[PDB]
């Protein structure tokens, strides 16, 4: 009877293991995207300093 | 004459000792069999609960 009541808990456990991978993959993707925007911004700054007018 | 009384008394001791001793030995065997068969039935009930749980799982 206790093991039968635990069937909903087992579904939530197995689904949570999948969702923990999913959440952290999605969040790592968000951070990689913004990190690459900052990488492109650092490149764009290294371009801005080539124009002596703005760089002055 | 007297030999039938000798045979009755020797058989009286033999029967009264042996029949009781065999029943005492049977009592111990039946008690051991109760534990063994109870456990075997408990294992069959466990196997049923497990097969039933697998059908839920």
Curated annotation (Swiss-Prot), chain A:
Tissue specificity field: Expressed in brain (at protein level).
Where does it reside? Apical cell membrane; Cytoplasmic vesicle, Secretory vesicle, Synaptic vesicle membrane; Cytoplasmic vesicle, Clathrin-coated vesicle membrane
- Superkingdom: Eukaryota
Q: What does this protein do?
A: Subunit of the V1 complex of vacuolar(H+)-ATPase (V-ATPase), a multisubunit enzyme composed of a peripheral complex (V1) that hydrolyzes ATP and a membrane integral complex (V0) that translocates protons. V-ATPase is responsible for acidifying and maintaining the pH of intracellular compartments and in some cell types, is targeted to the plasma membrane, where it is responsible for acidifying the extracellular environment.
**Subunit structure and binding partners:** V-ATPase is a heteromultimeric enzyme made up of two complexes: the ATP-hydrolytic V1 complex and the proton translocation V0 complex. The V1 complex consists of three catalytic AB heterodimers that form a heterohexamer, three peripheral stalks each consisting of EG heterodimers, one central rotor including subunits D and F, and the regulatory subunits C and H. The proton translocation complex V0 consists of the proton transport subunit a, a ring of proteolipid subunits c9c'', rotary subunit d, subunits e and f, and the accessory subunits ATP6AP1/Ac45 and ATP6AP2/PRR.
Give the UniProt family note: Belongs to the V-ATPase E subunit family.
Its recorded name reads V-type proton ATPase subunit E 1
**What is the native source organism of this protein?**
Rattus norvegicus
Point out the gene that encodes the protein: Atp6v1e1
